[PDB]
Structures are given as C-alpha cells and as structure tokens.
Design a protein around this ligand. Structure first.
Ligand SMILES: CSCC1(CC(=O)N2CCC[C@H](C(N)=O)C2)CC1
Ligand SMILES: [Zn+2]
Length: 140
C-alpha cells in the first residue's frame, strides 16, 4: 500500500483505490495502473520533473529503501493477475529489486523529488508507474 500526497491530490495504484477515492475522483487510467483523488488537506510530496534513471524506492516487504537503476517509461508486458489480464502497461519503468505482493504504492524518488510508485515486479524485478509527465499535479 502507499500513496503520493502532492497539493490537494492523492496518487494511488488504481487497483488499490478505495470507495472514497472513486467518490472524489480526479483522473484514472487503467493502462498505467494510476488513480488520483482529491484531498481536504495539502500534502508534502514534490514531483520530480526530470529524466533520472537512478533513484531509491521503498520496499514494505523488507522495511527498506533500496537504491536502483531503472529503465525509461515504456510499454511493457505484465503477466496476468488477479488485477490485470495479460496486457501492456504503459508508462512503466523496470528495475532489479525485490518485490512481492503487498508492495505496490511504495515511492520511487530521485534527487528532484517523487518519480513514481511501485506497480509491478517478481522475479527480482520491480516496475514503477511513472508520474513525472503529469504536470497538472503541480497546480489547481
Ligand atoms: C511478486 S508480486 C509483484 C507485485 C504485484 C504485481 O506485479 N501485480 C499484481 C497487481 C497488479 C500489477 C499490475 N500493475 O499490473 C501486477 C509488484 C508487487
Ligand atoms: Zn530526477
């Protein structure tokens, strides 16, 4: 579990969104595994606006933050789950790291701020839904 809290927005994995998230919906995209809802309180996270490929992510199944090298956001095949049918998840970045079930929502960050949230993995893989192109998170 986990979310990004920027301005009056809460960014979560679409597959983990609550009824309150759906009832206060700003934007959602199933191909990216992302959903954004509105919040009453202002958040403290800042979004990175960059092309970094190195950063650090939080792994809840290890209680640890790990430094990683990650790929650029791409259209990458994600094996079926209980959440998604084989498909192609867009704006996804991959790294070598531990992930197991339980871990989505953990933040990936670089020197500029929040880059994205854990969305996929397995294998000694971990994939990150990017948020750096969502410029509207910084306003309104
Ligand atoms: C070994 S479990 C790896 C995970 C879970 C995992 O990959 N999926 C299950 C939930 C939906 C994910 C999606 N973004 O399509 C796929 C990352 C924590
Ligand atoms: Zn950066």
């Amino acid at each position: 579990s986990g979310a990004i809290y920027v301005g009056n927005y809460r960014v979560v994995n679409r597959h983990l969104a609550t009824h309150n998230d759906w009832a206060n919906l700003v934007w959602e995209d199933s191909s990216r595994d992302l959903l954004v809802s509105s919040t009453t309180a202002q958040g403290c996270d800042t979004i990175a606006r960059c092309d970094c490929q190195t950063g650090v992510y939080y792994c809840s199944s290890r209680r640890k933050h790990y430094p990683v090298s990650f790929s650029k956001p791409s259209l990458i095949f994600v094996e079926a789950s209980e959440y998604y049918p084989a498909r192609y998840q867009s704006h996804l970045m991959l790294a070598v790291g531990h992930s197991e079930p339980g871990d989505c929502g953990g933040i990936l960050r670089c020197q500029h701020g929040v880059v994205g949230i854990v969305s996929t993995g397995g294998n000694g893989l971990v994939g990150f839904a990017d948020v750096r192109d969502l410029l509207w998170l910084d306003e309104e």
